[PDB]
Design an enzyme around this catalytic site. Structure first.
Site, PDB file in Angstrom:
ATOM      1  N   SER A 129     -34.915  -9.802  43.576  1.00  0.00           N
ATOM      2  CA  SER A 129     -35.304  -8.990  44.569  1.00  0.00           C
ATOM      3  C   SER A 129     -34.491  -7.689  44.618  1.00  0.00           C
ATOM      4  CB  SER A 129     -35.328  -9.535  45.955  1.00  0.00           C
ATOM      5  OG  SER A 129     -35.835  -9.291  47.000  1.00  0.00           O
ATOM      6  N   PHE A 130     -33.776  -7.503  45.620  1.00  0.00           N
ATOM      7  CA  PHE A 130     -32.735  -6.274  45.647  1.00  0.00           C
ATOM      8  C   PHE A 130     -31.907  -5.978  44.339  1.00  0.00           C
ATOM      9  CE2 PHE A 130     -28.039  -6.128  46.345  1.00  0.00           C
ATOM     10  CZ  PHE A 130     -27.831  -4.622  46.957  1.00  0.00           C
ATOM     11  N   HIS A 189     -41.008 -16.741  47.131  1.00  0.00           N
ATOM     12  CA  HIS A 189     -39.848 -15.848  46.684  1.00  0.00           C
ATOM     13  C   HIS A 189     -38.937 -16.423  45.675  1.00  0.00           C
ATOM     14  CE1 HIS A 189     -37.861 -11.881  46.464  1.00  0.00           C
ATOM     15  NE2 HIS A 189     -36.855 -12.451  47.319  1.00  0.00           N
ATOM     16  N   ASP A 224     -45.412 -15.133  47.031  1.00  0.00           N
ATOM     17  CA  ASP A 224     -43.997 -14.471  47.895  1.00  0.00           C
ATOM     18  C   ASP A 224     -44.309 -13.752  49.031  1.00  0.00           C
ATOM     19  OD1 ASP A 224     -41.915 -12.767  48.055  1.00  0.00           O
ATOM     20  OD2 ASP A 224     -41.288 -12.623  46.099  1.00  0.00           O
ATOM     21  N   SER A 259     -30.741  -9.808  48.723  1.00  0.00           N
ATOM     22  CA  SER A 259     -30.030  -9.333  49.835  1.00  0.00           C
ATOM     23  C   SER A 259     -30.166 -10.145  51.120  1.00  0.00           C
ATOM     24  CB  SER A 259     -30.262  -7.948  50.070  1.00  0.00           C
ATOM     25  OG  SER A 259     -31.569  -7.679  50.295  1.00  0.00           O
TER      26      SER A 259
HETATM   27 CL   LIG Z   1     -33.862  -8.680  48.816  1.00  0.00          CL
END
Ligand SMILES: [Cl-]
Ligand SMILES: [Cl-]
Lengths: 271, 271
Positions: free
Chosen positions: B101-102, B250, B222, B32
């Site tokens: 992630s998101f 990340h 990360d 995101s």
């Molecule tokens: Cl994210």
């Protein structure tokens, strides 16, 4: 007995070992359970790796079918010298090393004392950092022969106990009572056993100096060496990857054979 | 603009997506960050996976080139419904899902709400468990346009800052100021941002019920999502493997591209 392979004088000790495959050399170092041998530990690993590498799997002095010298002084340094002696005897100038538990501690020590002889390292449930002795390890090192005592050890190594059969317990029990085996084993890691974890382990300071590409593997449910140990190695070693197998005990090469072999072969393929 | 692909109505939203390859379907769900798109996130992943799988990489509603509906109510449930809507639109009855992630938080939620539609899951630096907001994530979600602000975000995502060039910072900055992008982005995760980590995350209780074969991947360094989060997912999910890349931020799919692609393809190959 398929556990018996070839014989060679290494570091002054007549050593039993397996040599399969061609190409880049890889040394496999077994764990320290009763009746252990290179073949018993690596029989499901050698076939896969030998298709792309020359695999050397020796019985460490004091274990398997290698000679057990009278009054021999066992120590991390002596074992490291044995590994180097084996490499010297086979004219292996530099090799990758895969170390299991006790063997993982030895792999780290070899990389520290003989950095120029070690390329890539795979540390499997390695005893490379200090951790409080587990009941699993206390049971393994405190083993006395019996089918039930061996069944318990096999249970300790496995996540899926369905793998532990009467047949396997019987066969490994028989392996543990071979001439001179229990004798050298029982005097190898005497109580208090915390001393030996501390001895085999390397300091945070030393581990941080390792320049080797490293692959750390651990079974989430490992009852012998806690997962926390490999998590720590994962933070200490610079060029390291950590791979944890869920639903897997100490036996990662046995309980996650194909995944393990794939990860290791591909890791070495990068070189 | 290669970030623009095909268009399809999904869950009532005109959606931009990429569809490459044949065979078993795999849905890739992006992160995101500002200016993010499926292509930007997965351009180095799609080529490898599409050689053996049908890869679907859509721009989630509110991101990339997918429509940004007026007064649209963004939420984990709405995003999950969008993913399912995309699958429905493409007649994809069951698929593997890779969430970044998101997107990893969304993958877990999809597996929980629509278990029959999800096969295997790859959770990459996933926001699937609660953790205290990091400065990295606060900076990403609190981004306002500028070349230097974007350079900082790229630094936050990378371990090796040599990958962050003036050119990359400029290109992503330009991506972030496209019509309507910053407008929808700035209102997506307003302060306090801890609320959104808590919202995206799934409870320990729910995560423990997941039956899916899962591969958890995380970059040791990360700065956006702490490694501790994936370590936790590794203890909660039953059939899970955890792989941590040292010297990687990340961006695991970007900084450890070949290793990442190999792990993922082989993981799916088992099915
Ligand atoms: Cl994210
Ligand atoms: Cl051991």
């Amino acid at each position: 007995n398929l556990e018996i392979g070839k014989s060679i004088l290494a570091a002054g000790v007549l050593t039993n070992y397996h040599d399969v495959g061609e190409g880049q050399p890889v040394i496999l170092i077994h764990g320290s359970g009763p009746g252990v041998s290179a073949y018993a530990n690596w029989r499901l690993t050698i076939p896969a790796l030998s298709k792309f590498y020359r695999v050397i799997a020796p019985d460490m002095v004091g274990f398997g079918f290698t000679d057990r010298p009278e009054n021999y002084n066992y120590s991390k340094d002596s074992w490291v010298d044995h590994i180097i002696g084996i490499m010297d005897a086979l004219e292996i100038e530099k090799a990758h090393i895969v170390g299991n538990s006790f063997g993982g501690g030895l792999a780290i020590a070899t990389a520290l004392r003989y950095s120029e002889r070690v390329d890539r390292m795979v540390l499997m449930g390695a005893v490379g950092t200090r951790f409080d002795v587990t009941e699993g390890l206390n049971a393994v090192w405190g083993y006395t022969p019996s089918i039930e005592n061996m069944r318990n050890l096999l249970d300790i190594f496995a996540y899926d106990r369905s793998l532990v059969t009467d047949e396997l317990a019987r066969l490994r029990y028989e392996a543990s009572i071979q001439p001179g085996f229990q004798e050298s084993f029982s005097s190898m890691f005497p109580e208090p056993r915390q001393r030996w974890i501390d001895a085999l382990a390397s300091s945070d300071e030393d581990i941080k100096t390792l320049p080797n590409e490293t692959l750390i593997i651990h079974g989430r449910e490992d009852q012998v060496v806690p997962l926390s140990s490999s998590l720590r190695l994962g933070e200490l070693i610079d060029r390291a990857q950590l791979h944890v197998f869920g639903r897997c005990g100490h036996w990662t090469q046995i309980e996650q054979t194909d995944r393990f072999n794939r990860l290791v072969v591909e890791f070495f393929n990068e070189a």
